[PDB]
Design brief:
Structural class of chain A: alpha/beta
Order of helices and strands of chain A: HHEEEHEHEHHHEHEEHEEEHEHHHHHH
Distance between the termini of chain A: 39 Å
Bound molecules: adenosine-5'-diphosphate
CATH class of the largest domain in chain A: Alpha Beta
Largest interface: A-B, 48 and 42 residues
Helix content of chain A: 40-55%
Protein name (chains A, B, C): Glutamate dehydrogenase 1, mitochondrial
Catalytic activity (chains A, B, C): L-glutamate + NADP(+) + H2O = 2-oxoglutarate + NH4(+) + NADPH + H(+); L-glutamate + NAD(+) + H2O = 2-oxoglutarate + NH4(+) + NADH + H(+)
Strand content of chain A: 5-15%
CATH architecture of the largest domain in chain A: 3-Layer(aba) Sandwich
Enzyme class (chains A, B, C): oxidoreductase
Oligomer: part of a larger assembly
Largest sheet of chain A: 7 strands, mixed
CATH superfamily of the largest domain in chain A: NAD(P)-binding Rossmann-like Domain
Main location (chains A, B, C): mitochondrion
Strand order of the largest sheet of chain A: 9-8-7-6-10-11-12
GO molecular function (chains A, B, C): ATP binding; glutamate dehydrogenase (NAD+) activity
Number of domains of chain A: 3
Amino acid sequence: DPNFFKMVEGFFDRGASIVEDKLVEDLKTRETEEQKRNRVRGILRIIKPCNHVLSLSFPIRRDDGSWEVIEGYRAQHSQHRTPCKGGIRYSTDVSVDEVKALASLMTYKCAVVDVPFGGAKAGVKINPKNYTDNELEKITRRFTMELAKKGFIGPGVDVPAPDMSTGEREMSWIADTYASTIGHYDINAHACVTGKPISQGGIHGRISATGRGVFHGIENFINEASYMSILGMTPGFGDKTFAVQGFGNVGLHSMRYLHRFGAKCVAVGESDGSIWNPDGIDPKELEDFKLQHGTILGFPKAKIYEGSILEVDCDILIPAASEKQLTKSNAPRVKAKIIAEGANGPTTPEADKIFLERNIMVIPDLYLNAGGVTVSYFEWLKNLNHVSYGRLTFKYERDSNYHLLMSVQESLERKFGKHGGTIPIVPTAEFQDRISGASEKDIVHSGLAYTMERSARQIMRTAMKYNLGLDLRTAAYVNAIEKVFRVYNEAGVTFT
Amino acid sequence: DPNFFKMVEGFFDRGASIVEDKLVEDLKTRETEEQKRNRVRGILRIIKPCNHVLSLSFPIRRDDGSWEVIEGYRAQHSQHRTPCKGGIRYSTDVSVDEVKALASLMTYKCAVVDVPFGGAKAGVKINPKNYTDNELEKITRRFTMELAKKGFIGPGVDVPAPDMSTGEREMSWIADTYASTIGHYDINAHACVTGKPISQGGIHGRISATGRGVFHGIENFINEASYMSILGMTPGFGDKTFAVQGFGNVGLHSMRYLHRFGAKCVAVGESDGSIWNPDGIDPKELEDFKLQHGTILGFPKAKIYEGSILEVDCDILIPAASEKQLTKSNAPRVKAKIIAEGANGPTTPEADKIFLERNIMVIPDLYLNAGGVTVSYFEWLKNLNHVSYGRLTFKYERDSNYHLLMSVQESLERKFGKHGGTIPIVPTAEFQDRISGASEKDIVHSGLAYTMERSARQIMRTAMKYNLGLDLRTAAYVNAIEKVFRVYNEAGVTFT
Amino acid sequence: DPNFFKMVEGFFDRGASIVEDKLVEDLKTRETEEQKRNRVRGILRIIKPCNHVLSLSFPIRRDDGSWEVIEGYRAQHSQHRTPCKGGIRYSTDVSVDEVKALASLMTYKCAVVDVPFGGAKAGVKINPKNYTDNELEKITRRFTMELAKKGFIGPGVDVPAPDMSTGEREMSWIADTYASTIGHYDINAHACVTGKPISQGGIHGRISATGRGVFHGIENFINEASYMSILGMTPGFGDKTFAVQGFGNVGLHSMRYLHRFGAKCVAVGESDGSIWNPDGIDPKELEDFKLQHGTILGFPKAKIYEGSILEVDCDILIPAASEKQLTKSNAPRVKAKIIAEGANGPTTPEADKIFLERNIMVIPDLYLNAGGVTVSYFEWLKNLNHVSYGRLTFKYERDSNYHLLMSVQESLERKFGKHGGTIPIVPTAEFQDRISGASEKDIVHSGLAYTMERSARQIMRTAMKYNLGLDLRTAAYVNAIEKVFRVYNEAGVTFT
Ligand SMILES: Nc1ncnc2c1ncn2[C@@H]1O[C@H](COP(=O)(O)OP(=O)(O)O)[C@@H](O)[C@H]1O
Ligand SMILES: Nc1ncnc2c1ncn2[C@@H]1O[C@H](COP(=O)(O)OP(=O)(O)O)[C@@H](O)[C@H]1O
Ligand SMILES: Nc1ncnc2c1ncn2[C@@H]1O[C@H](COP(=O)(O)OP(=O)(O)O)[C@@H](O)[C@H]1O
């Protein structure tokens, strides 16, 4: 047990060193005044620390008429990409050292999924309970104010997002505050923050995002025989079998989207206890079974099983909960062959270590739960576009598609004295329903999917030119460093 | 063999006169207060000269600690279209009278290819050699500064680009300077200049842009039997044969893309000497053969041939070098049937004259090397879109496409007791590779081709209208004069 | 006995408590919904902590081509007054916790001398030695940049100033950077920072400013028999006698301006050793004597005396050096009857305590070395005025003055058969030289003393209001709190 701030910092130094020798080179193969390049490693010392961090105290006024001051931080890591992105945390456990780590995390996380934002993160030292809905709103709005005035929020400067401590509403308040104040004259005022309600300029399909990110990330590697050969898989065992720890939003969708492609939830474990059925626990019901109650416990069919499931027999173990739940102790011990980080840093740097050796593939948090970020990028664009995705093209292609099927029809019925004998026109049962109910959402998923795939392959190749086999994490961090580097490099030295 | 400034100015006056009589009419057929429209030629008097030209002297400081002042000009021709476009030249031979001519040239060149920019051009009276890389950067950045402060650079005002004297690099410096200074608050700060590296917001497929522009321009006329009849071509002579003078970026790609479609580089000539093989010099090697050296000379297989190529026996002669290399004297002497201007004004108004008569087709610089401009327009849009072309859509259609092929399959397999007998699903061998490796560049290329063809068509009619035959140039100028006139007409009449 | 951050914090809490009971009243005597005002002490909880503090890391690049990142902080305490004021410190000993304290200090220091600025302070974790003049400049400029972009410098937002670690030139760099960058369009761009050279918009008489502040502060109390009665003075002892510890800029001018009005420097002590003569050490020579050398040591006339001076027999002891050098130990122990804080917090809260009791008057740092701040306010105004003080009026009243003397003359010469017998016209010997060499400086000097004079009796009356007797410090702290309170109250408590 270290703390993030550290792991991330360690994760960087490492990827930084791995890249360096081969960032004098593969690149300026050559150009070499001096052959100190070895040297534009000053670049990497610039990249490392957060460039800006604003701490502030601001007063709100509670409903009981009493004044109270509030502490809050927002740290902008890099600005190599022009608008900073990152969530806002409402917890009494927010430290300046952490918003800084998490800002540091997203700087690279965005790079991984080709999202053109610099990493940022905010924290308000508050516990959203001790405050009413009216009180929460005042905090957000007054917070939005101070950020704007010091350039830590703005559609071209810094675009926040919600954490798990905050909701779409608070984002709505943030947007509405900015648009009615400093950003009155901004035609893109509502692009100042993402994760906001649809009625307020939100994007469709923001909720499945993180979960699907986990899915496609797993799948990209699950269909690569190389990595599946080292574990000896492209699976043979009940076809597939997985356990999910943490039945939050991310874990839920993860189980669902994975189950439906022929994979088997053997066990689901939560904050409380856990459950098991080796037949397949089934999303859905479990799902219903809970909204239904309050927990997963006492589930029919499925079993009080217990402690954590981090080591239930399976292939794919999915941490979708808090931190650190794969330490070192329960490390040589998991089973799961593929550990899919559906949460930020749920494995200590040593779990990685024992895992790496035990010949099991840990799919990095840096890459896997970047699904939400990827879609948040799309929401930001949507606001800049001032139009829902697909609105002007949905009907155009529906026509075009029917026009092809009509063409295949005619062409076949000439070959051939006819009319309406041969009937290609009909789309498949699904193709109809998808043509039928095409919405922005479908584009957003399709975008996410392509991004995950394209990013999955860039990690696989970065891992290979570096001879890295199963340590996807530092390979992922490396892919990030190289990307953040050339932005700095091919920009200049003289001015800023 | 005068100043280039002239030809352009002569080229205009001419197209202006041709349009005029029929710009009292074809338009206000009628409307006629007075019947002086004949008079809203004041419009054409306004269109003609550059509206603004800024000369400036600014100090840099060399690496040897010595101060040195630097002269620089940028001329904005028209602002009928809201952001000015045009390159920056680093040569000691830049005159104020030239940046004006070239600005004048692009003002019409953009109109030809429906690119919504006003013509501009900058020149820094400097020789990039006598200066280090550090020194070059200082010059750019300080130059970018002064332009910004006087409104001669900005994403909505004036968007520069590189010339052959400048690289992507310097464009990167320009962008980074602007974004860190005057345009800090601009959400489109990096749209202030094009031709910049991909890591800095450049567009994929820029390098081939100007070269392909040359290709498609040639091809559009090469597949029209009318124009190919007058020369007696839709070619018969070794199928096809062409000589390229100037092995720069434009000439290189030109030879490659032309060769590829069954056409034959008989000869390649450069700054130094020249080269011949009547079998086909082959891009490629010549290409490699040089990167390789420093020059084309001493090329195996191909021969020390010598002086300029401008009259080597071929059909298509492609000037892709400096100015004026088709004067007058070597005019009734070329052989080439088709002179494809892959550079700005390489033929004097007189070469045109003898050529026109000798019944050979000169494809205008005004239209042909507008390929780079067309794509620069796309780069500008890309920055406004804040997303790479095809991103969110590449996978969406890949799905959609497979969905249709699936539909054609099913539909045919009912006609018919089956399953997977009939197999439409498979795309053609190419359609796969296209779907497979779809990238931004494919979108860029498709856009470039579309523009070049449609402009060729636009030109061909304006030619056949006034029965200009093979006078493609003053047709395209007439085309451009008309377009620039319209915007002026249906707008400013009493003020601004 | 404390450090830095703490004394100030303690100094506030205290004055805050003293004011409170009488800040439900003297004020809203009355108005009392509820009678919880006792409550708009939330105001005082808001006033207390700094509202904003920006930490940043930024790269410079040394002359040896190596990259190096640099840490820097600037804290804005209050913004009840619209442009923040405060110095910039170049020391490796800068903590985030001091820049906050010192920002906190000035927020009240300005209030004391009716200077309408909110307290701020910056620190760059650097040692100006290990860096060349070229290197120092890059640090300043790049630092100025990041402050501007986050709204921590600007003529209407935050106006910095030099500390002892920084000079007028770095201020000049700061101004020139801002004016050439973010604040290019600002007609008051050079009002962004004070303490800059005269050629760069500095004000005349900035150097004597802090020193004279010390003088007039001492003098205001030295001519009040009440306070001079409790010590039993309006002095009788060698008329007067004073020791100065710290021969910096402030201590130097202090000794000079004090000496000049019939007061004796008995002893001068420094960083190194010390010096005594009970006859009078004489500014001037000591002054000359060291420019001369490097130190005060080995001074003729005057003696190696030694250790600190802090207790040499005198009336007035003037700490014009580092912190803390009146602790507690050497507290019941001084003799000086008047301790004039010519530096920030040179007495621990306990020295105050023993002093208060021992019936000796400590003139607060909060009030005394506010002379520099007062004049810095004038420099800010000067830039806003875009004209040197007195320029259009100097000659006008020179004429007016001579016109009165002419009037007195004539009028007397009627009373009386004459012409030019009676001669009032002549000004006094001084009045001539004053009229003769009137400059901006004379206005600046004037404006300062009136401030020090009025602020003096503002504190006297407040000390009187709360029966604080000789607790001049928390008389001044209370005095500031009241001011900052009224601003906060008589405006912003709803959503501001
Ligand atoms: N966060 C980031 N940091 C550094 N580079 C990035 C980041 N996001 C994207 N890039 C880079 O920007 C370049 C330009 O990409 P572009 O073609 O505009 O879209 P895409 O990134 O989808 O290909 C790419 O080479 C990509 O690696
Ligand atoms: N650079 C230009 N200068 C003058 N007129 C132009 C220019 N570009 C386009 N136009 C004219 O303006 C009209 C509006 O263009 P539009 O059809 O909306 O876009 P596009 O030019 O991309 O087809 C076009 O028909 C064209 O004739
Ligand atoms: N930094 C400050 N904080 C709070 N109040 C202040 C500050 N500076 C000045 N004031 C108050 O603002 C008021 C404005 O008075 P004004 O007419 O400007 O007279 P003066 O020129 O003496 O300030 C004064 O009563 C003064 O007490």
